Amino acid sequence: VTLGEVWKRQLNMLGKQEFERYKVSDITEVDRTAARRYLKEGRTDVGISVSRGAAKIRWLHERGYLRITGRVLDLGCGRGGWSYYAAAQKEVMSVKGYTLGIEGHEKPIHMQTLGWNIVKFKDKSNVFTMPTEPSDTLLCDIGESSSNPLVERDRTMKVLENFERWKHVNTENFCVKVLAPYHPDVIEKLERLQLRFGGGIVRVPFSRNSTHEMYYISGARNNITHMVNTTSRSLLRRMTRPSGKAIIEGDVFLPTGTRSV
Ligand SMILES: Nc1nc2c(ncn2[C@@H]2O[C@H](COP(=O)(O)OP(=O)(O)OP(=O)(O)OC[C@H]3O[C@@H](n4cnc5c(=O)[nH]c(N)nc54)[C@H](O)[C@@H]3O)[C@@H](O)[C@H]2O)c(=O)[nH]1
Ligand SMILES: C[S@@+](CC[C@H](N)C(=O)[O-])C[C@H]1O[C@@H](n2cnc3c(N)ncnc32)[C@H](O)[C@@H]1O
Numbered sequence: 193v194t195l196g197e198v199w200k201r202q203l204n205m206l207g208k209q210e211f212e213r214y215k216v217s218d219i220t221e222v223d224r225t226a227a228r229r230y231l232k233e234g235r236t237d238v239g240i241s242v243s244r245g246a247a248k249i250r251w252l253h254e255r256g257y258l259r260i261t262g263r264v265l266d267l268g269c270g271r272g273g274w275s276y277y278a279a280a281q282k283e284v285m286s287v288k289g290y291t292l293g294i295e296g297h298e299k300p301i302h303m304q305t306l307g308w309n310i311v312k313f314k315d316k317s318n319v320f321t322m323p324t325e326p327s328d329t330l331l332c333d334i335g336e337s338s339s340n341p342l343v344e345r346d347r348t349m350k351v352l353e354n355f356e357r358w359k360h361v362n363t364e365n366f367c368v369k370v371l372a373p374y375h376p377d378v379i380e381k382l383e384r385l386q387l388r389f390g391g392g393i394v395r396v397p398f399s400r401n402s403t404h405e406m407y408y409i410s411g412a413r414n415n416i417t418h419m420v421n422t423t424s425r426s427l428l429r430r431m432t433r434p435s436g437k438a439i440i441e442g443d444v445f446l447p448t449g450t451r452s453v
Pocket of ligand 2: 242243244245246267268269270271272273274275290291292293297298317318319320333334335
């Protein structure tokens, strides 16, 4: 019914070569060569990012969609790309990252980029069931892809519901993955959240064309339906005319060392 739903149905119809060409068409990618080299080598003294995911938060932060300040919570931190990014930022006082890190899920990677000493990771932590805590900046990058649109809807709704559960009165800043934003139930939920909390939704250019993921953020106000439909139309247009070529950008590099505050 929605254009996003049309997009999702059509993505599954793509043969191998068409899918591979499509997913990278006109997207932005960070060059992960240096980071992969030092990660393989096992170095902790080079200011690399532990994941490709750090590129997404850098973009959101630098483009002004998200202030990162105070006590930061990183829900579903995985390797910790968003946690280390946050820890290096001027106004950040501490970062707490929670993740499952069990049964095939990514474990936090120990690194010594700026502010590593103000980061605390806990694995074996299910953010859907564990007790909440206050934060000034609440990050959540959770949303596992599925070819079943109903599974993506359910996963998205659980993330948005858990976000409202964790969000405290002092949580003025936030960034939450919205895996499948086009689903009418998800649009409705986002609209309700926006009534209470403000903010808006944005497509991060580092996302592959094979996902409709968008981020619900605190730093900009916009029209949810319009922003979602604009991304759906963009994804559909890229499908009709796939370039098969990504724009390459420099990776997220950080200083190394401890911080006092
Ligand atoms: N290994 C690795 N790669 C990273 C990373 N970051 C970016 N990449 C970049 O991702 C590319 C491969 O795509 P990836 O395997 O990571 O996931 P893709 O988008 O294929 O698929 P996925 O996100 O897992 O699934 C999205 C949806 O696409 C659809 N889909 C997946 N595979 C296929 C397919 O084979 N055919 C069709 N028609 N649809 C598919 C399904 O609907 C699925 O729900 C890499 O070459 C690299 O440039 C990283 O941290 N690790
Ligand atoms: C997309 S990755 C996060 C990437 C991260 N932002 C980065 O830059 O490295 C999502 C992570 O959330 C974790 N996760 C999924 N469900 C979770 C849950 N219920 N509780 C805690 N972590 C969860 C997954 O294991 C995965 O490692």
